Structure formats: C-alpha cells, structure tokens
Design a protein around this ligand. Structure first.
Ligand SMILES: Cc1cc2nc3c(=O)[nH]c(=O)nc-3n(C[C@H](O)[C@H](O)[C@H](O)COP(=O)(O)O)c2cc1C
Ligand SMILES: Cc1cc2nc3c(=O)[nH]c(=O)nc-3n(C[C@H](O)[C@H](O)[C@H](O)COP(=O)(O)O)c2cc1C
Ligand SMILES: COc1cc(CCc2c(C(=O)O)[nH]c(=O)[nH]c2=O)cc(OC)c1
Ligand SMILES: COc1cc(CCc2c(C(=O)O)[nH]c(=O)[nH]c2=O)cc(OC)c1
Lengths: 313, 313
C-alpha cells in the first residue's frame, strides 16, 4: 500500500502539501515545511516588492474554520526565487512557487525570471488567479476576459508547464466558462481548486464585533465551512479538464476529508486552515488516516480511486 | 419583554419565519407553519404550472448542514394564490408568497394576478431570482442585466412593494453592482440574503458516492456551512441599501445565530435547514434563546442592536 505519486515529472512521497499562504512566508517556514512529512510544499504568493500586508488582526480561526484578510504579506519575489534557486533541498521534496502579482505586467516580469530556475532546478509555478486586479472590478478569476489575458501573457512569457489557483465558483455557467478558458492553454497542466470562499463575515456574539480588522471584517473563509464547495470545484474541473491535473484544497482536517478530495479527482491535496491550527505534525496524521481508509477498502494506490466518486443512477 | 415588531405595514410577533421551500409546499405544511410560534411564514417558490421536481434522493442533511437539488417541486401558483386569498388566517401571522418563474414573462403573469390579493389581504411577494440551471446561461442574480430586466418588469406588472430573494455573492465588486441594481427599484422594499450556496458536493466516504441523485450530486448548501457567507451578504446589503429592509437567511440554528444576523442588519430571520431537521418547535427555542441573550446584554428591543455590529479601529 502506498501514497506515492509521479506527476509533472516529479515524484511525491504522498499527496499532501501546505496550502499557499500557510507556513510558507519566511525561510524558517519553508525549512519547517521541508522537514515535515508532507509530499511537497508551496511558497507564499508573492509580489515583485515585499509587502507588510494588512493590519492585524487579520486571521482568526474557530471550530468550523478560519477567516483572513492577510493582504498578501510576503518577502518579495527575489526572496522566493533565491529560495528556489539556492536554498531548497530538492532531494527532500518538490517545491511550488506561488505568484500573485497585482497586474498582468507584474506577473509577466516574475515568470520571465522564474523560467530559467524552473528549467534548471524543477521548481513548479502556481499562478494565483484568485486575487485583485483593478479595484472595483472582480477578482481576476471572476473576470473571464482578464483571466484569459493573464493566461495568454503568462504562457507566452514563461513557456513551461505551470498551474493555476482558482477561487471557488457557485454557478454551473461559471464552471463551464472557466474550464473552457483554462482548456485554451495547454501549458496549464494543473488546476488547484479552491482558494478561500470570498468575503465571508465572522461576528463574535459576546463582543458584538467582527473578528478581523481589515475590510470591515470581511475576509476569505477556509476550513470545515468550505469542504463541500471545495469538493464540487475539484469534481467540476476534473470532469471538464481531462487533459489537466486537479489539486484539491479546502476543508481537509482528516484522512477522510483527503480521501473525499481524491475521489472527486484531486491529485495533490493541500492543507490550509487545519495546518495553521495544528502545525506540521498534521501531515503524519493525515498520511496514517488515509492509509487506514485505504487498508479497510482494499486500495493499494491512489489511482485505484482517484476521480472514482459514484453518482446515483 | 417580547420580540414583536412592525415591518412593511404589518405586525409580526417575532422576527422568525421559515425559509422558502422548507415546511411550506402543501396546505398541511402551511397550516403547520401557521400554527407554529413563528412570526411569519413564506410559501414554497412556485411556478405557473405544478412541478414534480427532481428524482429522489434530492435533500440530505448532516451535522454541518444540508444539500438539495429539489428541482422547484410545487403545487403551482393557482394553489398558493388560493391559499393566500381564501385559506390563510391573517389574524395569526403575515404570509409571504414566493414566486420563481422560469422566465420573466412567467413571473409577470403571476405577479399581475397576485397584486389584487396583496391589496385586499396583505400577502407579501418574495421574488426568487434563482432557478434550475440552463446550459449557457448564468443564474439571473449573477447576470446583472438580466436581473435589472426582471425587476423592471416585475415592478411594472406588480406595482406594489415586494422583496427579492438573492443568492450569495463573494466579491465586493459584485456586492456593489448588485446593490446598485436593486437600488434602481423603489418598490423593492426588502432583500433576503441568502439562498443556498450554489453547487456544493457532498460525498459519503463509506459508499464512495454522492448523496443526492440529481445533477451528479451537486446541489445548494445550507446550514452551518453558510453562516459567515450569510452574515456577509446581510451586512453588505444592509450597508448598501439604506432605504430597504434586509431579511437574513442562512445558518440559523440558535438564538445566538439569530442575534448575529440581526447585528449584521436583519429585520426578519429565516430558518431553513435547522427547521427541516428540528421541526416547527424550533421557533419557541429560538425566541427563548434570543430573549435570553438580549436580557443578559440589557437590550430591550431589536432596534437597539440591529445593524450595530462593531468593526475594529
Ligand atoms: C492565512 C492564510 C493565508 C493565505 N494566503 C494565500 C496565498 O498567499 N495564496 C493563495 O493562493 N491562497 C492563500 N490562502 C488560501 C489557502 O491557500 C487555501 O486555498 C484556503 O485557506 C482554503 O483551504 P483550507 O480550507 O484548508 O484553509 C491563504 C489562506 C490562509 C488561511
Ligand atoms: C429543501 C430546501 C428547499 C428549498 N427551496 C427553496 C425555494 O423554493 N425557494 C427559495 O427561495 N429557497 C429555497 N431554499 C433555500 C432556503 O430558503 C434557504 O435560503 C437556504 O436553505 C439557506 O438557509 P439555511 O442555512 O437556514 O438552510 C430551499 C432550501 C432547502 C433546504
Ligand atoms: C486581503 O488580501 C487579499 C489577498 C489576495 C491574494 C492572497 C490571498 C490571501 C491574502 O493574502 O489575504 N488570502 C487568501 O485566502 N487567499 C489568497 O490568495 C486576494 C484577495 O482577494 C481576491 C485579497
Ligand atoms: C435544482 O432546482 C433548482 C431550483 C431553484 C429554485 C428553487 C430552490 C430550490 C429547489 O427547489 O431546488 N433549492 C434551493 O436551495 N433554493 C431555491 O431557490 C434553483 C436552483 O438553482 C440552481 C436549482
């Protein structure tokens, strides 16, 4: 029985990795993720320039999940590029670098300089499309024409296989349109579903107050709140993009939740809120729990059940 | 201390009511809701002709909430109009009639017939913008020009104050665009936030199966999964639509969750999944729990705290 995967020309000990933004901002964080039992790691979505992010408190967690308005705090592209080129130990596990430029030109600039390091060291690009474009317009992946522009420009500039991080969608027309856009780009080899569920609002009844400072308390939701939305998006894109891999993210706290992701179609399974709350020890637990479910079911590998969710009649 | 309030020229014993679709399809259901301690009731969304809806199983519930692909099963508009005109006992509580025609013309036809009954009996209209998916077409509330058409046409045909049931939004640009659409229509006097979160997917790990039959398991989510989404939509519309009322719906299981909706801006508070699971006895519990929280805080009225959620700094 085994959790091994071979994808994107890399070998992974198991499907588990951090979700971008969690335990991945500093050198310390990346070294921690590397020392963990995860099968891979991704860096914090970066910008060309370092950012302090939004005012605190900007993340909070609760029994059913988390809310955040971090504001893209990061050490800047040059730091994450240096990590990928000079610091990461590729013999331990694969590295993904996530980018979230504030314009198409900023993304193009970064990917042009990442390309040679991708080619030589094997760092994998995850392009975050669930992020700001022009304020007062929807986020990029909710603006299909912007999305298409970003993917055309990054594909030309980078020239290598990459993946995309998508926000969740809630309407079948949007699943159809989004996937049609992604299927125009043969270099998009993976799709990570999902980023946080946008603009939720947590209110504390005792204090009668929102719990995070930025944006009048509004922020992206993660955790147990989002698991059925995550699974839906994984399966929707799995069905619509047969030539691409799908990575699942959202609501994973247990090997059972991971098994559901994988049944929906996930290759890799990313862990955000629960990793933020439990710490990197979570990965041994998730591995053990998933292997227990596989043993009970008689499955020896992940491919025996990936995407094999049953429908009724 | 009592929870009675006046809205839309009607008196309500308390702010609680069923969510459309739950305990409100048949005469039996409507009589049960009328006998309950709820402050009001709403009928199942109707179409001009009766519909059987989708194949079973089409609703399932779990500790954290529910999923449904009912398919708009209903007894047809003639039935609900007859209930409003001849059977409902208005001395017991106000009645809302929910309509979900599959085209603008169907909605127009229904509202022209409802108008005199509204004038004579005081039945209130809730116009449901959600309907079964049509390939190639977004849901009406996610297509702002379609929304504008529907509301223009309904406003003209109906001529009286009405409300609109909205799906959730997840992007601040969309809140701004949607509210600006709604604010073009002075007869839209209330907005209900929110319908179920669209196109979630619940998978059973033992059976490796989806749990509802229609639409390959995809359905709308309700319950605990959706409370932060609901609160965000209530507050975003409360802030943007100062001349309207907002009715909260989503995730209410307790008087604390009601309290949160009201702090966010809700005038009435609708109960879906929790009502479906607990039954109509839930209304006495919610009323007792909300009065207790008020008493512990020193609030004597709903008005003292409605919309008064505190932000940080
Ligand atoms: C504190 C925090 C920071 C995040 N920052 C990023 C980010 O930089 N890039 C990104 O693609 N997603 C980011 N996300 C989203 C997560 O990658 C993930 O998509 C989301 O939290 C849902 O997964 P979960 O339910 O396991 O939390 C962040 C999430 C959290 C909680
Ligand atoms: C079985 C079921 C049927 C529903 N049918 C309708 C409907 O006919 N009209 C409508 O506006 N909403 C309908 N809804 C949505 C609910 O009114 C409500 O917006 C949603 O379930 C979220 O509230 P909750 O978290 O309390 O369940 C239905 C929900 C359920 C569970
Ligand atoms: C408040 O700051 C942000 C930041 C981003 C990009 C980074 C990001 C963040 C974050 O840095 O806040 N949080 C997420 O849950 N996911 C993300 O992808 C998107 C975003 O909305 C699209 C708002
Ligand atoms: C599968 O059938 C439907 C039905 C409707 C309208 C009635 C309705 C239903 C329902 O009858 O399925 N369920 C909801 O949660 N909300 C609703 O508004 C919307 C709808 O949105 C996709 C799908």
């Amino acid at each position: 029985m085994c959790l091994k995967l071979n994808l994107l020309d890399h070998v992974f000990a198991n499907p588990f990795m951090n979700a971008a933004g969690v335990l991945c901002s500093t050198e310390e964080d990346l070294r921690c993720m590397t020392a963990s039992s995860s099968g891979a790691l991704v860096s914090k979505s970066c910008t060309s320039a370092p950012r302090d992010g939004n005012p605190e408190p900007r993340y909070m967690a609760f029994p059913l999940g988390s809310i955040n308005s971090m504001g893209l705090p990061n050490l800047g592209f040059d730091f994450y590029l240096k990590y990928a080129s000079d610091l990461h130990d590729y013999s331990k596990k694969p590295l993904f670098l996530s980018i979230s430029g504030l314009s198409v030109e900023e993304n193009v600039a970064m990917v042009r300089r990442l390309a040679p390091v991708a080619q030589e060291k094997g760092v994998l690009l995850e392009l975050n499309l669930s992020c700001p474009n022009v304020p007062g317009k929807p986020q990029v992946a909710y603006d299909f024409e912007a999305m298409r522009t970003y993917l055309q420009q990054v594909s030309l500039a980078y020239g290598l296989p990459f993946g995309v991080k998508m926000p969740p969608y809630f309407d079948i027309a949007h699943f159809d349109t989004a996937a049609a856009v992604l299927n125009e780009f043969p270099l998009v080899k993976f799709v990570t579903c999902v980023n946080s569920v946008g603009n939720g609002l947590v209110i504390d009844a005792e204090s009668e107050s929102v719990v995070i400072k930025p944006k009048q308390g509004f922020g992206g939701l993660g955790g147990k709140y989002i698991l059925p939305t995550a699974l839906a998006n994984v399966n929707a894109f799995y069905r619509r993009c047969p030539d691409k891999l799908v990575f699942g993210c959202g609501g994973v706290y247990s090997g059972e939740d991971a098994f559901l992701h994988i049944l929906a179609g996930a290759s890799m399974v990313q862990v955000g809120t629960a990793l933020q709350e439990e710490g990197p020890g979570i990965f041994t637990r998730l591995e053990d729990e998933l292997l227990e479910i596989m043993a009970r079911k008689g499955y020896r590998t992940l491919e025996e059940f990936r995407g094999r969710v049953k429908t009724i009649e």
